[PDB]
Design a protein around this ligand. Structure first.
Ligand SMILES: [Zn+2]
Ligand SMILES: [Zn+2]
Length: 70
RNA sequence: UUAUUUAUU
């Protein structure tokens, strides 16, 4: 998968252990975080779901603008 | 509208 180790392994960051071990598809260290190939218009238009429901099921992985302030 | 994204041995 192109998403391999593109996101932190949350169970490893929370408890320091992971049942997937060296085969875990998520990052156990920031040294393993790779670069995501994203659409050239990534976050250039307002996310309809976040600007309508106040939330978005894609979370920080959404390809559209949620809040313009960090 | 670019209308999208892996919780996985
Ligand atoms: Zn893990
Ligand atoms: Zn969104």
């Amino acid at each position: 998968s192109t998403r391999y180790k593109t996101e932190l392994c949350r169970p490893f960051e929370e408890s320091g252990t992971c049942k997937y071990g060296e085969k875990c598809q998520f990052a156990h260290g920031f040294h393993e975080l790779r670069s995501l190939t994203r659409h050239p218009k990534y976050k250039t238009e307002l996310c309809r779901t976040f600007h309508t429901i106040g939330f978005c099921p894609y979370g920080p992985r959404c390809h559209f603008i949620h809040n313009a302030d960090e």
